[PDB]
Amino acid sequence: LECHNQQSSQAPTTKTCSGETNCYKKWWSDHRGTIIERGCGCPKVKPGVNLNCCRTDRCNN
């Protein structure tokens, strides 16, 4: 699957994974502002950080 792996609001990017079927997209609002990360899988996090898995191409755009 061609998911996304670009942190912050920098120049987007695309890549393929060899194993995981679903991806995700996490983000939060720190003192610095708002940040967003991606990755192939569906982990969890401690209260305070948002995250959501998906099974669509560039779903974590």
From Swiss-Prot:
Expressed by the venom gland. The record marks 56 as: May be the main cause for the toxicity difference between this toxin and cobrotoxin-b. One of its GO terms (cellular component) is extracellular region. The keyword Disulfide bond applies. SUPFAM superfamilies: Snake toxin-like (SSF57302). Its main location: secreted. One of its GO terms (molecular function) is toxin activity. Keywords: Disulfide bond, Ion channel impairing toxin, Neurotoxin, Postsynaptic neurotoxin, Secreted, Toxin. InterPro entries: Snake_3FTx, Snake_toxin-like_sf, Snake_toxin_con_site, Toxin_cobra-type. Disulfide bonds join 3-23, 17-40, 42-53, 54-59. It comes from the Eukaryota. It is found in: Secreted. Pfam families: Toxin_cobra-type. It inhibits muscle contraction with an IC(50) of 0.20 ug/ml. Produces peripheral paralysis by blocking neuromuscular transmission at the postsynaptic site. Binds to the nicotinic acetylcholine receptor. Belongs to the three-finger toxin family. Short-chain subfamily. Type I alpha-neurotoxin sub-subfamily. This is Cobrotoxin-c.
